[model samples]
Target: GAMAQNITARIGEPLVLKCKGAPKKPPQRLEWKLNTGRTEAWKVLSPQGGGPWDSVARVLPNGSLFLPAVGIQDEGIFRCQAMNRNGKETKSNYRVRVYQIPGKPEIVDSASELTAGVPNKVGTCVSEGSYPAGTLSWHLDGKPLVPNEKGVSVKEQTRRHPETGLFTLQSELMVTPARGGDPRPTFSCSFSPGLPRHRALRTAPIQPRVWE
Candidate 1:
């Protein structure tokens, strides 16, 4: 038996749970169970064997489970157990977390251009709305911008979308032009989200714009 592990996924996405990853020997008896946070006892989950899992998930030949379409209630601990028939049962757990991705990220500027002497409101990057809250960042060209630059300051805020009941966030930056400031840089925003089964490095950068 192995300790439980955490697994993240997006809603309505596909997920695959293998009995083991690249193991030398495979098991003969394969079973999957679900923990819906109801009781200590786990409910049997078998799409192939015919149950609730049959509708939402499918069991593979090697005792692995496949979720063609994940739902919100599907979020919980999933157990995969196997046996060699000659040996003891080998079990592993997957703690499932399902989430949603917000709409496109946007950069709204208060002042699109730099003013010579006075402090200007550079812009704010906003991530529309989503479940389980995503991440936001301000970038310089393709890289992350330094926050310690002289005369440059930034702040962030996060809230829930009333209609969607999802998380939304924005980061505001203040760019104060120095008397001798010449490194006029273009700023961009990025939203990194935790994707579903694929575990991809999901990042979407807002359209590029710069302060003159």
Candidate 2:
């Protein structure tokens, strides 16, 4: 028997379970069981004869289980047992946890709001409370905006779970006024990897005013 680390995954994502250290014999059998309610039932995916399991889940050469597109109900305890005609048997247990991703980014007015004649102005856009922290970027009129050498900067802040070790990312983009015309260029801060669905897209609603 071999011990396995806890498995963590987002809803509707793939989950992999690694099982190892089974006896090597021609007549040995390997089986998987799931703890559903008070009963431990046989797994739909199990090894055939003296070979590896080959049902819903494919068994790798190294004896790992791979489950694609896991759902919330899939979170539970799993066990693997090995048996042989020699009256030898081994067993191990594993735990699985699922988490949800947060909502999209929110665009808000910065502390120092964009005002007339304020070159190199600063604005803050925050995307907080997100799991598997999404990415952030600055765009102008549908095109990505680059920071000016002296007046523009970007910063990202993130936090992680101590137990499950998941991360949440927050990004901020600061821009200075562009030269001459187009003082109020359309600017937007986008956050992706939102919840309700796994679709990844940036949040909309461009900023009302630009740097200059």
Candidate 3:
């Protein structure tokens, strides 16, 4: 007896499916298939024997398929068949769907208003929700500023979607403002690799109020 289930996911997310119940003698081989009737060819996601699959999908310890960074093209029915040395086989099927949604980046931190002369102060830019995530950068007056002692640092965090497996990338930036007398220095946080430069920006030339 065999069973199958349906799997759904958002574009750019991870997809995981599993199959079980295989006879124990004679070394069974697991094979997969797509809706195009194309047989699922094994890719080098991991070493043949075992370990984390690093390419397309990873086979879990329990025979579940783990597909990271799933895309629209990955949608379809997948079949897993267990074949024995005698050429006898048992098989099961599962459905996978990749849904499309509007692409937008979520900013995690509140934008900070900074003055020219502040020292040891930090500003953060968090970009999320975009597919494959994106690159984060700090700019001044619409130009890339040199990062120095009081500079910007970028870091990427792990992102996972219940439907899709995992995002290709996610990142953050920390900016330490330069000390100066100019009250209005155009500062912006930008994310790139987007169509026509998909980007988000805060109000420019943030001027911190001075108390006398």
The per-prediction tally of clashing pairs is 1, 2, 10
Q: Between 2 and 3, whose TM-score is larger?
A: 2
Q: What lDDT tens digits, residue by residue, belong to model 2 across residues 158-196?
A: 787565444566666666554564655666677666333
TM-score of decoy 3: 0.39
**C-alpha TM-scores of all predictions:** 0.65, 0.47, 0.39
lDDT of model 2 at position 43? 49
**Highest-scoring model, lDDT:** 1
User: Residue 111, candidate 3: how far off, in angstroms?
Assistant: 5.9
The candidate maximizing TM-score is 1
If the candidates were sorted by their TM-score against the true structure, best first, what order would they fall in?
Answer: 1, 2, 3
User: Which is superior by TM-score, 1 or 3?
Assistant: 1
lDDT of every model, 2 decimals: 0.67, 0.58, 0.51
How big is the positional error of residue 129 in model 3, measured in Å on the Cα after superposition?
Answer: 3.2
**Clash pairs, model 3 backbone:** 13-164, 13-165, 14-164, 14-165, 14-166, 45-53, 45-54, 45-55, 46-53, 106-128
lDDT of 3 by residue, 110-198 (tens): 34454343432334455445444445555666777455545555566656566644343344444555555344555565556432333
- Model 1 segments beyond 4 Å from truth? 1-6, 20-29, 36-41, 46-54, 58-62, 72-75, 85-88, 97-104, 129-131, 140-143, 146-149, 161-166, 194-212
Candidate 2 regions with alpha-carbon error over 4 angstroms = 1-28, 31-100, 111-122, 129-131, 147-150, 161-166, 192-199, 210-212
lDDT of candidate model 2 versus the reference: 0.58
